[PDB]
Amino acid sequence: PRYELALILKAMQRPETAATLKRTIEALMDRGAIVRDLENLGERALPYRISAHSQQHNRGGYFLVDFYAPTAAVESMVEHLSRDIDVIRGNIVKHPLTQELKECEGIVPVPLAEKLYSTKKR
Amino acid sequence: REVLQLQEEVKNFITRENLEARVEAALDSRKNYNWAITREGLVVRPQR
Amino acid sequence: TKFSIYPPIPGEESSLRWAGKKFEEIPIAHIKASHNNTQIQVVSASNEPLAFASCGTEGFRNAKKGTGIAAQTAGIAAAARAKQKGVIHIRVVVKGLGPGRLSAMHGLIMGGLEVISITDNTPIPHXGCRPRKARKL
Amino acid sequence: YHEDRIRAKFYSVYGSGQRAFDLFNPNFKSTCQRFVEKYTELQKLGETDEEKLFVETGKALLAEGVILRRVG
Amino acid sequence: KNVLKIRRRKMNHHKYRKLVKKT
Amino acid sequence: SNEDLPISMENPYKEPLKKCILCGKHVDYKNVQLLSQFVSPFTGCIYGRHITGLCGKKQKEITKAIKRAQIMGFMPVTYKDPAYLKDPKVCNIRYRE
Amino acid sequence: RQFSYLIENMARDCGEYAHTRYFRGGMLTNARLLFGPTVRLPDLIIFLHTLNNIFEPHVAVRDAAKMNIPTVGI
Amino acid sequence: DPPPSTLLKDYQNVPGIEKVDDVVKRLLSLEMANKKEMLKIKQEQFMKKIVANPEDTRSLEARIIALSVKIRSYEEHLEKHRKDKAHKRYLLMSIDQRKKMLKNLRNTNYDVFEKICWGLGIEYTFPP
Amino acid sequence: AKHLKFIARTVMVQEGNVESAYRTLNRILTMDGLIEDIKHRRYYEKPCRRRQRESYERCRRIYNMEMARKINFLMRKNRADPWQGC
RNA sequence: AAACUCCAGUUGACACAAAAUAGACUACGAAAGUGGCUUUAACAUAUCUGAACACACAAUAGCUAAGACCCAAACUGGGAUUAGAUACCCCACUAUGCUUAGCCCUAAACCUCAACAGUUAAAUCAACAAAACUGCUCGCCAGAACACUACGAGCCACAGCUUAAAACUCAAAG
Ligand code: FES
Ligand SMILES: [K+]
Ligand SMILES: [Mg+2]
Ligand SMILES: [Mg+2]
Ligand SMILES: [Mg+2]
Ligand SMILES: [Mg+2]
Ligand SMILES: [Mg+2]
Ligand SMILES: [Mg+2]
Ligand SMILES: [Mg+2]
Ligand SMILES: [Mg+2]
Ligand SMILES: [Mg+2]
Ligand SMILES: [Mg+2]
Ligand SMILES: [Mg+2]
Ligand SMILES: [Mg+2]
Ligand SMILES: [Mg+2]
Ligand SMILES: [Mg+2]
Ligand SMILES: [Mg+2]
Ligand SMILES: [Mg+2]
Ligand SMILES: [Mg+2]
């Protein structure tokens, strides 16, 4: 199916960041993936201190990778990311654009519940 | 119709030949998914 | 400009300076308001112990330590040991819902120290370790 | 009634005008009611669409001197 | 509703479990 | 017979059903600027549908997106990102007074 | 209470009676004790308001049917 | 088992899909789909092979075929998840519901009862 | 621990008014629910007991929210008697 | 009081444990039960009822084997209270709670209110509770106690579970 790889790389120079992206995308193609795009969300400060591969990170580069791949290639790709030191954190999720949103009409009011107790003189 | 639309997009997919070129381009652009909303249900995208 | 109750963020420069110092350089007063005691410890921005006081160190024993008098007495003793080192403005960090949660803050004001901010660091787990069983008293 | 569809649209397009109702007077005609009479009279002519028929009704009142301030 | 009929069965079971442990 | 009798008709004056501010919009876990509009500036706690004003179907989407962005490294847990403190307030809660 | 004065006047004008006040228990079923053994009860009762001030039926509606008195009601 | 290169049930019929790019044919295959798309094709094969009118799906025959594809799916899921007691109950009930279909079919149309038992490899066993 | 310090549950003092700040801080924790949550987490509340309390707290909210809706609906009749004497 | 005092506080590093807020939502599942994130597989039946001759499940506790161990904690020890306290309160610690492979098969397993279909009128209706009824089917109950017992039989269960009486006794029990 169609997946999305939320990748958080390490704060590195451009020469090293390009080698990691290419290294990471070649791993997807080797497992039967069909990459579609490579979006960059920019280098920002992490919401909290992340510790990975005996390193305390405070900044990182956010990159997205939309691609198609079989179901059996997800588990094999999650292991590769773990070994890579440059990758602080990487997770795969089903692409949100492959989930049609049912049209909504509006909020339906709910009337108070009636006939919960017998109409007897207590 | 879906197949035809897909047959056009496949040209833009990354490949081993154009992999290096696409990487550099991504390092030059930026995508912003951040946008707020008001009480009137109106999107407010940041001026950046 | 206006006044905001939100503290200044280190990343963003601010115009609020106390005695020519930034919000980050201000020393910190860690208060631990327990149910039977109240410890106070003042530190600098670089985590350097300046003064330490507690209801026990002031002479109170057993149940008399879990009062607002012993907490205030401990705040005055911590504000007198830190004022000798050049401490005027502090950032309070309370931890716990004990009796001396507010009374200790008063003793610091009665020792010549000015409180610019109040931070709550009470430990709440998001689940965590299972507490002891409920009492029948 | 059949004219309730007309009133619902008039109040939405224009809304109750400055003129205040006089419920005491039995033979009282409101600005909206006057709009219904014309709207229906033009329907007798043969127009079969609401949009054109609705628009033509407002013009007739404006010619008669009625004040029709739309919400916009 | 009271538990007087549960209390009769409570002692019956307790005395029986205590008698088996003894024999 | 008579023509003044009422007719079997649906209510013309009935008003359209109300919609939440997010009706028809896509909630994504990367839009931290939108997700921070529904958390406490001080504790980072998620607000309820009686404060946000959202419907059940959309309040569940904001929650699942916040919990996903917090553990992925996009959004903080204990506090609201100061960068989004000057954003339009859509929640019906007043702390100071 | 809004129409208590109006009704009391009408009864006086038409030479009839009115009871617009709090209805004490036994005005009809226990009348002989309240008024006297030779008292004469109404032959017709007219209810201009069949409800009391708590939005419940007036007690006289039931007490009149007990004493076989016909009632007229709005 | 349908090969992975097989196209989806929906996309095989559209015209012009015979001459397209190889990448577009690999995205519309069973390789880039879930397990439930391969089962929609397994069912299609049995209908043409066994049922007289493939289009009709409400007939007692088709219901047996639709259910026999689910039974095989549960056995492949239980071969890897032995401690999944939920799917082990759906299997034993589905096997009992198919037997109730085969009983009503053997009592009405014995000519087709033999066809389904042969096509799907089923052996009706009289209960003890 | 891993988050930035002095950004959560922090309140600044205005004109050395510590009292007004402490009341504000204690009102933010109460409205968010931390205060009550910290008190129940002192001793372990077993599931059965926690499910009995949530049902009690939810039935109290309903009743208290409907009575107040009737008080504000009848407060309009708290005026003087217009038919004084009848 | 005892205990601790290679303790306490600030900071940093740091889980095979447990899963704030959202939830004022009321969803999923046959029930048990299920509320941190991601992915994979995946939630029977085109009439209904239907197995206490069978099959598959079944909270917690507990048994067997191998591991993990922050915290909690039967047992036990100490302190205190008490006429005594084998308890209620305080401290410490163990089995156990977790993982894996098997067993055990119990509950106020109760929303004590069976499944399918259908009704709101008549006598609505002992009382209380969560208003009163129809059709059809399966299951179950026939005074209290003896009795979640004895015997018999079956079961990886051996101080066990399931099925389950009798004699004597009472004029009440409920
Ligand atoms: S009302 Fe349409 S999505 Fe909330
Ligand atoms: K119950
Ligand atoms: Mg009672
Ligand atoms: Mg007994
Ligand atoms: Mg059945
Ligand atoms: Mg059964
Ligand atoms: Mg069990
Ligand atoms: Mg165990
Ligand atoms: Mg312990
Ligand atoms: Mg002892
Ligand atoms: Mg242990
Ligand atoms: Mg346990
Ligand atoms: Mg239960
Ligand atoms: Mg029962
Ligand atoms: Mg049944
Ligand atoms: Mg009996
Ligand atoms: Mg038992
Ligand atoms: Mg037995
Ligand atoms: Mg035996």
Give the integer Cα–Cα distance in Å for F63 and F38: 9
Q: What are phi and psi of H25, to 5 degrees?
A: -80, -20
| Chain F environment of B34 (Cβ under 8 Å) | 30-34
Contacts of H83 (CB under 8 A, 6+ apart): none
Ligand 15 centre distance from Cα of residue E5 (Å): 29
C-alpha distances in Å from residue D43, one per residue of D37, D40, D46, H4, H96: 10, 5, 6, 66, 68
Residue corresponding to tokens 């007087």: E4
Q: How far is the CA of C132 from the centre of ligand 8 (A)?
A: 22
What is the CATH classification number for the domain harbouring A86?
3.30.70.60
Residue with the two structure tokens 């509009």: F37
C-alpha–C-alpha distance, residues H112 and H61, integer Å:
8
Nucleotide at minimal C1' distance from the A92 CA: J38
Ligand 1 atom with the shortest distance to the CA of A105: 2
Inform me whether the C-beta atom of residue F94 falls under 8 Å from chain C C-beta atoms: no
Asked if A70 has any chain H CB less than 8 Å from its own CB, the reply is yes
Residue D42 DSSP symbol: H
The amino acid that residue I47 corresponds to is P
User: Most D CBs within 10 Å: which of F3, F9, F10, as the mutation test of the D interface?
Assistant: F9
The single-letter DSSP state of residue A9 is E
Nearest partner of F54 among F95, F19, F24, judged by Cα: F19
Measured in whole angstroms, how far is the alpha carbon of residue F60 from the centre of its chain? 10
Q: What 3-state DSSP class applies to B36? A: strand
Which residue in chain I has the smallest CA separation from F93?
I31
| Token pair listed for I31 | 């409205």
Q: How far apart are CA H12 and CA H33, in angstroms?
A: 14
Alpha-carbon span E8 to H9, nearest angstrom: 69
User: Nearest 5°: CA angle at E17, between E12 and E19?
Assistant: 95
Touch between chain D and chain H (3+ CB pairs, < 8 Å)?
no
Please say whether the beta carbons of B7 and H21 come within 8 A.
yes
Selection from C104, C135, C127 nearest residue C38 by Cα: C104
Q: How far apart are CA C78 and CA C105, in angstroms?
A: 11
Q: Which residues contact H88 (CB under 8 A, 6 or more apart)?
A: H78
The answer to the question of residue A12 being in a domain is yes
Please, which residues bridge with residue A45 across strands?
A59
Q: Tell me if A110 is assigned to some domain.
A: no
CA–CA separation, F78 and I10 (whole Å) = 12
Name the token pair of C101.
Answer: 């949660």
Give the number of domains in chain F: 1
Are the beta carbons of C74 and C107 closer than 8 angstroms?
A: yes
* Residue G64 CA, distance from chain mean position: 9
Which residues have a Cβ under 8 Å from the Cβ of C57 and sit 6 or more positions away? Answer: C74, C77
Strand partners, A43: A61
Residue F58 CA: which ligand 1 atom is closest? Answer: 4
For residue F26 the two structure tokens come to 């896509």
Distance CA A25, CA B17 (A): 12
Structure tokens at I70: 């009737």
Neighbours of G44 (CB within 10 A): 10
Alpha helix ranges (H) inside H1-128: 22-27, 35-50, 60-78, 85-108, 110-119
Name the CA radius of gyration of chain G, rounded: 13
Task: Extract the tokens encoding H42.
Answer: 């397994």
How far is residue G25's CA from residue G34's CA, in Å, rounded to a whole number?
Answer: 10
Nearest protein CA to atom 1 of ligand 1, as residue = F19
Cα-Cα end-to-end distance for chain B: 37
Q: In 10 A of CB I61, how many CB atoms?
A: 10
Kindly list the distances between the CA atom of residue C76 and the CA atoms of C38, C45, C79, C113, in Å, as whole numbers in the listed order.
Answer: 13, 21, 5, 10
Helix (H, G, I), strand (E, B) or coil at I22: helix
Which residues make beta-bridge pairs with A60? A10, A44
How far apart (Å, rounded) are the C-alpha atoms in residues F81 and F94?
A: 19
Which residue matches tokens 């538990």? Answer: E3
Backbone angles phi, psi at I51, to 5 degrees: -80, -25
Report residues near ion ligand 4: CB below 5 Å.
Answer: E 12
Domain ranges, residue A70: 2-94
Which residues sit opposite C28 in a β-bridge?
C43, C91
Q: Is residue A6 part of a domain?
A: yes
N-terminal to C-terminal alpha carbon distance within chain A: 63
Give me the count of residues in chain H.
128
Residue B43 in tokens: 């999107």
Q: Which phi and psi angles does F86 have, rounded to 5°?
A: -100, 30
* H51, H44 Cβ separation under 8 angstroms: no
Measured torsion, CA atoms of residues F79, F84, F90, F92, in degrees rounded to the nearest 10: 30
Q: How far is the CA of C131 from the centre of ligand 9 (A)?
A: 10
Residues whose beta carbon lies within 6 Å of some atom of ligand 1: A 104, 106-107; F 19-20, 23, 55, 57-58
Burial H71-88 (b: 16+ CB within 10 A, else e): eebbeeeeeeeeeeeeee
Rounded distance, CA F47 to CA C109, Å? 36
How, if at all, do strands A56-68 and C89-95 pair?
unpaired
How far apart CA B2 and CA B4 sit, in angstroms, is 5
For chain G, helix (H) and strand (E) counts, in that order, are 3, 2
Q: How far is the CA of C64 from the C1' of J87 (A)?
A: 29
> Which residue of F27, F38, F55, F62 sits with most ligand 1 atoms within 8 Å of its CB, as the best mutation to test the pocket?
F55
Three-state DSSP state, A26: helix
Q: How far, in Å, CA of F35 to CA of I38, rounded?
A: 26
Residue type, F70: Q
Residue A99 lies in a domain: no
Q: Report how far residue C40's alpha carbon sits from residue C93's, in angstroms, rounded to the nearest whole number.
A: 10
Residue A63, SS3 per DSSP? strand
Q: How far is the CA of E9 from the centre of ligand 15 (A)?
A: 30
Q: Whose CA is nearest to atom 3 of ligand 1?
A: F23
Cα distance between residue G47 and residue G74, in whole Å: 6
Domain membership of residue A111 (yes or no) is no
Cα–Cα distances in Å, from D41 out to C89, D37, D47, D67, I29?
A: 83, 6, 10, 20, 67
Question: Following DSSP, what letter does each residue of chain C receive, concatenated?
Answer: ----SSPPPTTS--S--BTTB-TTTS-EEEEEE-SS-EEEEEE-TT--EEEEEETTTTT--GGGGSSHHHHHHHHHHHHHHHGGGT--EEEEEEES-SGGGTHHHHHHHTTT-EEEEEEE--------PPPPBPP--
Domain residues for the domain of F43 are 2-97
* Residue in the structure block whose two tokens are 């096997």: H95
Identity of the amino acid at F82: P
The rounded distance, in Å, linking the Cα atoms of D29 and D11 is: 15
Rounded distance between C-alpha atoms, residue C31 and residue C75, angstroms: 9
CA B24, chain centre distance (Å): 15
The answer to whether the CB of F53 falls within 8 A of the CB of F45 is: no
Q: CB count, 10 Å around CB of A106?
A: 13
Pairing outcome for strands A2-10 and A87-94: antiparallel
CA angle, residues C76, C112, C30, in degrees to nearest 5: 55
Residue A13 one-letter amino acid: Q
Dist. CA C80–CA C91, nearest whole Å: 16
Among candidate residues I72, B27, E22, the one with its CA nearest the CA of residue A43 = B27
Closest nucleotide over all strands to C39 (CA to C1') = J9
**Neighbouring residues of H16: CB distance < 8 A, sequence distance ≥ 6:** B3
Burial of C39 (0-12, 13-18, 19+ CB in 10 A): buried
Q: F61 is written with which tokens?
A: 């989407």
CA distance C50 to C81: 8
Task: Give the residues across from I74 on adjacent strands.
Answer: none
User: Whose CA is closest to A7, among A108, A105, A110, A77?
Assistant: A77
Pair F21, F90: CB distance under 8 Å: yes
Tokens standing for D40?
């229906």
Q: Which method resolved this structure?
A: cryo-EM
* Å between CA of F60 and C1' of J35: 12
Structural domains counted in chain A: 1
Q: Is residue A108 part of a domain?
A: no
Q: Identify which of G39, G36, G38, G28 has the alpha carbon closest to the alpha carbon of residue G62.
A: G28
Instruction: Report the relative pairing of strands C89-95 and C114-120 from DSSP bridges.
Output: parallel
Joined together, the tokens standing for residue A85 give: 């030191």
Token couple for B31: 């995508």
